[PDB]
């Protein structure tokens, strides 16, 4: 693992399930003091939790102020909380489109804005933003989601440039990962049949050169690496955890 | 020139000055029927103008309706209206940060959302979004601006994917261009002395491989190309009009 | 069209068929004085031809020296000559792998190296290199081809930076285009049945968001634009002519 | 550290000095069995070394055979051997230009070609290719070098796509790193005065957002991560270790 993460205060947003929970658990395994900021209670977890809606800047500020007071520092912030709904720009209501931007982009902006002042009071703090392989190659009927993930890359570069060399900021760009959100995405297409869901997921996995979809722990490994001193000269970039998806053209060749 | 642009209905937002004006002027020269949507009166101009705030969906929808019923179609929409102010995520007020996102991103979303239903009723319609070289290489203390320009790329790709093959959508990514906004940027750094402002602009020009900053008409040439049938198999991309800025590492080598 | 191209001397390599022939014909239509450098005679063509193997630097130099002497100048060079054979790095012989690099990369290097000295003696000369959508998203069993197309982008950036602002250099990145090479690629997979070939080609076309493969003339339009003064502030970039292929993730979403 | 790297057989080319040496040294610290393939003797070193010219396929194949038969497997291949000389496409001899391509590209191709058949017989083998930040943003008078580094990216993607899921292949893209080659670059500009060389290096460091040049060990950290199981779903990508250089536009803004 990354020994330097031990005992450091790590905040992870949206860590009650899926990738966020996997990230929180990895940091706990690294020995960090982890706090989850989410609207849902992670239940019996080894990490701390504060009820917090990332779209509410006042609650985000209060939660972060509380963490600094309780723990004495903040060394790592992982922005992960996000949502996805589908629809053509003409079908999705303007409210829902804006809501996706609010959670996926503004949530990252608020958490970063309020954590940074405290983070720079620590040695070599690091922010990791979870974007998507869709910051590059995109899906249909996902206007708001795709727009928000591209925005996250811009926010990431900005924070990196504005605060270097004291604080580093990078993003992780995952492709299809085995999470509740993805299983739900499949159900929205094939129904509740566990057999038919495995088929749709297998189809997606076969589209990735690695021939399977990713695991939450694989995204968590990239986050831990970027948050650690092992990435001391890495800032402003997105580490793609996509099983090769973003470099594959879907055009057959003779074999 | 592009003969196919003659008589086509072209909407350009923020065309009362700078790049937007050069774009409207180029389409007028191509024989198109051009309408400028902006909150400012362009004064004496060879193109039509409608008082419209791009961040007000009611005004945008109404303006687009006035154009379609009056002209009979809408073939090209050029989203250009934008703004920029500086400050670290820490100093800039949340309100100003949100405003930059509202104008630079939501303005593009509203105009596209309301124009698309009309545009798809015409043959080979196209949307061109003005992003920035900062969708790739960025500047300091410009997080809202940088985020918004990255967001525009995501919006562009999604409209391109959701509406191909009937409608194409691309972006233009300009570096430093001679515009009032760029002159305001210089002033905010070196004062109001017009001569010092010229020295600053020259410094920026020398950072571009082309050794000068770009001209509004050069951005307009790219927009006209992408809007034309000459770009019939081009969609979802950003055409960089940056004088080589984005491919240059600021690291000297032996000469 | 691009009026500024009229009467200018334009050299196009590999212009006896496919994209190269389409590029040569477009420049002839623009009124340019065009010369094809290839090993095959274009037969009855409106453009000039010189028998030339781009992998032979001495023949390339001699041919270019001859053109400058005969025509008095060289304003545009379009590097297009290329080949493709398939095979895993373990199956393709080292000789064939090297041969692909020789034609696809070294051919561009030789033509550029010998034309540049003459080109800078003209006003605003421009080089356009034909790369591929595979400079970004790639196909399987195409190691040498993919490597060569990435190399072409590096060569393009280098020439652009080294000679700005006098000479511009850009690349065009086409996806699947209807050419003899592509039809042959299909035959290598489905056989000579015109019905089965149309099916394979249709399959490829459906993978592009535009739902069809591109036409040679569409690539030629991008080349003419980049070679013209309409692209006066564009240098070091690749204009993707891919029908949206490079921005598409092959992952379904609910609809 | 990455516990999975213990006892794994790791080949590193050009590891007698600089980045290559730091990479070999890091793998030795991880408990791997490391073999350096280079034409130079690393002298006193904690890792094994074989006299081998990476541009000589007979020597490469023989060395890889000596390693597999002696150690029983090959789990990781790090292609690093490279060189750089300066000059415009016009001045540099064709022989020197070809040589840079031979070492920087063909050396990677030969080592990969001969190691792959052995590597795929082990579980989860991985190849890491050292490219450069110049696979994106480039320097002047370095066409052969720049071309070769872009070529390495194409080679990387193709090996990743052709051999997934059994073997992964990624690249590391370093910006300015403290190495002898970087010190030679400074000398070729400011002379042999060690103090002036330090001033030059400092200038380059200040161009990176991190305000310093990178350390060989920082590149090694990235290589070890990509070679490890921690990067199990990461393939075909380039991890930028550039201190933010590639996302920085050299354009000032108000402060
Ligand atoms: O790989 C594409 C992936 O993008 C991200 C999520 O939305 C999921 C999807 O499977
Ligand atoms: O070149 C970077 C440019 O980006 C865009 C504007 O904000 C201006 C700036 O000079
Ligand atoms: O779109 C991918 C295309 O790449 C290029 C050619 O090799 C052809 C292929 O169809
Ligand atoms: O940062 C750019 C760097 O690219 C690599 C080397 O050639 C060195 C240079 O300083």
Assign residue D118 the CATH number of its domain. 3.40.50.720
Report how many domains make up chain A: 1
Helices (H), A81-213: 94-101, 107-119, 143-163, 180-190, 194-207
Nearest CA in chain A to C205: A251
CA separation for the pair C44, D134 (Å, rounded): 44
Which residues are within 8 A (CB) of C168 and not within 5 positions of it... i.e. 6 or more apart? C124, C125, C126, C127, C160, C226, C231, C232, C234, C235
Rounded to whole angstroms, how far apart are CA atoms D14 and D126?
18
Nearest partner of D159 among D167, D147, D150, judged by Cα = D167
| CA of residue A201 to ligand 4 center, whole Å | 42
Ligand 1 pocket, residue A176 CB under 6 Å: yes
Which helix (DSSP H) or strand (DSSP E) does residue A78 occupy?
strand A76-79
Q: Is the CB of C244 inside 8 Å of chain B's CB atoms?
A: yes
Q: Chain A residues with CB inside 8 Å of D237's CB? A: 239-240, 242, 246-247
Q: Is B227 in the pocket of ligand 2 (CB under 6 A)?
A: no
Instruction: Answer for the pair D206, A200: CB distance below 8 angstroms, yes or no.
Output: no
Answer whether D158 sits within 8 Å of C149, measured CB to CB: no
What is d(CA D169, CA D235) in angstroms, rounded to the nearest whole number? Answer: 5
| Distance from chain centroid for Cα B26 | 14
- Listed by number, the residues of chain C in 132-191 with a beta carbon closer than 8 Å to a beta carbon of chain B are 157, 160-161, 164-165
Q: Is D85 on the interface with B (CB under 8 A)?
A: no
**Among residues C79, C72, C254, C50, which one has the least CA distance to residue C152?**
C79
Residue C79's SS3 state is strand
Nearest-atom number in ligand 2 for the CA of B142 is 7
* Whole-angstrom distance, CA of residue D135 vs CA of residue D147: 8
| D47 annotated ligand binder | no
Does the beta-carbon distance from A151 to B105 stay under 8 Å?
yes
| Residue C180 CA, ligand 1 centroid: distance in Å | 36
User: Alpha-carbon torsion B172, B178, B181, B186, what sign?
Assistant: positive
From the number of C-beta atoms within 10 Å of its C-beta (0-12, 13-18, 19+), residue C117 rates as middle
Q: What's the B242 CA to ligand 2 centre distance in angstroms?
A: 10
| Ligand 4 residue neighbourhood (C-beta within 6 Å) | B 249, 251; D 84, 132-134, 175-176, 182, 245
- Please give the resolution of this entry in Å, rounded to 1 decimal: 1.6
D245: Cβ contacts below 8 Å, ≥ 6 apart: B249, B250, B251, D133, D137, D175, D176, D207, D208, D209
Nearest-angstrom CA–CA distance, B103 and B82: 6
CA dist list (Å): D106 to A100, C91, C157, D181: 47, 16, 21, 20
**A148–B158 C-beta distance less than 8 A:** no
- The annotation places the binding site of B at 16, 19, 53-54, 80, 82, 108, 145, 149, 177, 179
Neighbouring residues of A192: CB distance < 8 A, sequence distance ≥ 6: none
Tokens 């415009």, residue located: D88
Question: Distance between CA A124 and CA B54 in Å, rounded?
Answer: 42
| Residue C114: its H or E element | helix C107-119
Distance CA C117, CA C162 (A): 13
Helix (H, G, I), strand (E, B) or coil at C76: strand
Give the domain range for residue B103.
Answer: 1-255
Q: Is D251 in the pocket of ligand 2 (CB under 6 A)?
A: yes
CA of D175 to the centre of ligand 4 (A): 5
CA distances from D127 to C170, D156, D159 (A): 32, 9, 9
Residues B99, B250 contacting (CB under 8 angstroms): no
- Cβ D115 vs Cβ D11: under 8 Å: yes
- Determine the distance from the C-alpha atom of residue D80 to the mean position of all C-alpha atoms in its chain, rounded to a whole number: 3
CA of B182, closest atom in ligand 2: 8
Q: Which atom of ligand 3 is nearest to the CA of C134?
A: 4
Q: Does D87 touch chain C (CB under 8 A)?
A: no
Closest CA to A199 of A183, A179, A180: A183
- Other CB atoms within 10 Å distance of the CB of residue A192: 7
Q: Are the C-beta atoms of A61 and A118 separated by less than 8 Å?
A: no
Closest to D165 in 3D by CA, of D226, D230, D234: D234
Under 8 Å CB pairs connecting chains A and D tally to: 114
Task: Give the gap in angstroms from C-alpha C80 to the nearest C-alpha of chain A.
Answer: 21
Chains that touch D (3 or more CB pairs under 8 A): A, B, C
Angle subtended by helix axes A143-163 and A94-101, to nearest 10? 30
């Amino acid at each position: 693992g990354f020994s330097d993460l031990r005992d450091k205060v790590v905040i992870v947003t949206g860590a009650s399930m899926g990738i966020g929970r996997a990230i929180a658990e990895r940091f706990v395994d690294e020995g960090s003091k982890v706090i989850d900021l989410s609207i849902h209670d992670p239940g019996e977890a080894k990490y701390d939790h504060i009820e917090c809606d990332v779209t509410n800047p006042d609650q985000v500020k209060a939660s972060i102020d509380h963490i600094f007071k309780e723990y004495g520092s903040i060394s790592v912030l992982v922005n992960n909380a996000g949502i996805e709904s589908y629809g053509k720009i003409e079908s999705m209501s303007m409210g829902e489109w804006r809501r996706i931007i609010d959670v996926n982009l503004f949530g990252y902006y608020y958490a970063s804005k309020f954590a940074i002042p405290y983070m720079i009071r620590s040695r070599d703090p690091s922010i990791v933003n979870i974007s998507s392989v869709q910051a590059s190659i995109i899906t249909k009927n996902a206007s708001a989601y795709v727009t928000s993930k591209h925005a996250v890359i811009g926010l990431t570069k900005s924070i990196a440039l504005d605060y270097a060399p004291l604080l580093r900021c990078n993003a992780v760009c995952p492709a299809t990962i085995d999470t509740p959100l993805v299983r739900k995405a499949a159900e929205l297409e094939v129904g509740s049949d566990p057999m038919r869901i495995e088929k749709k997921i297998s189809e997606w996995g076969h589209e990735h050169p690695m021939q399977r979809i990713g695991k939450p722990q694989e995204v968590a490994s990239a986050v831990a690496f970027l948050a650690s001193r092992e990435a001391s000269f890495i800032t402003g970039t997105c580490l793609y955890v996509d099983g090769g998806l973003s470099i594959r053209a879907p055009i057959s060749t003779p074999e």
